[PDB]
């Protein structure tokens with residue numbers, strides 16, 4: 001548990017990142033393929049994120065779950081902080097949803113099954129409010145999703161203003177109104193995601209901050225024609241204004257639309 005740049009061979013960049021890029025790395029000893037996040041100190045320094053990184057890391061360290069991108073560890077140098085991450089060979093769900101436009105019920109219901117497991121285990125570890133939008137989602141080699149919502153792992157560079165609203169569309173009423181909140185915020189995310197997987201855009205898109213504030217606080221959304229009865233049933237239950245009328249994660253996994261559709 002005391003790593004350095006030299007335990008690792010360095011391959012190509014997997015992609016342009018936010019405070020640095022991700023690279024293919026290979027542990028010299030095991031010959032194990034890995035991803036390496038490069039986080040430049042000068043850029044964390046400015047942005048004002050230095051201690052936020054520190055926070056996220058010391059937490060992500062103690063989280064082991066098939067649907068969470070493992071952090072194996074990290075280390076720094078003169079100029080860079082290095083995150084040693086699991087490698088998810090396939091893209092982000094975001095890239096997939098861009099070629100496809102939308103997923104079918106089987107895939108969507110599987111995605112939701114895995115986020116529920118990752119989420120219930122998160123809640124069991126006292127960890128809540130997980131940023132599960134599609135660009136925070138990687139695909140492993142079996143097509144299985146991995147939540148990558150820390151260290152800017154798979155964040156594309158952005159304007160800082162572009163990042164501010166990174167997650168507005170995924171925020172529950174109790175968070176955009178500034179009231180206090182509990183684990184139930186993840187159940188609302190799940191509902192957004194489910195709607196986004198089926199239709200190709202999250203339910204509350206709008207132009208202005210204010211218009212998006214309105215649509216979220218008073219839960220104004222509609223389903224297109226094709227969204228089937230069971231899916232509307234599920235989404236509808238998850239997108240309830242009152243936090244405590246949202247299902248337990250358990251009843252999400254037992255919902256008959258999920259069981260009809262996953263694996």
Ligand SMILES: COc1cccc(-c2nc(Nc3cc(C)[nH]n3)cc3ccccc23)c1
Nearest residue numbers: 014015022035086087088090091154155156
């Ligand atoms: C902006 O989207 C980004 C940013 C950085 C890397 C990728 C990316 N990542 C991975 N896998 C990864 C990445 C990590 C930290 N573990 N496993 C695979 C890809 C494949 C095609 C294009 C892009 C990929 C995307």
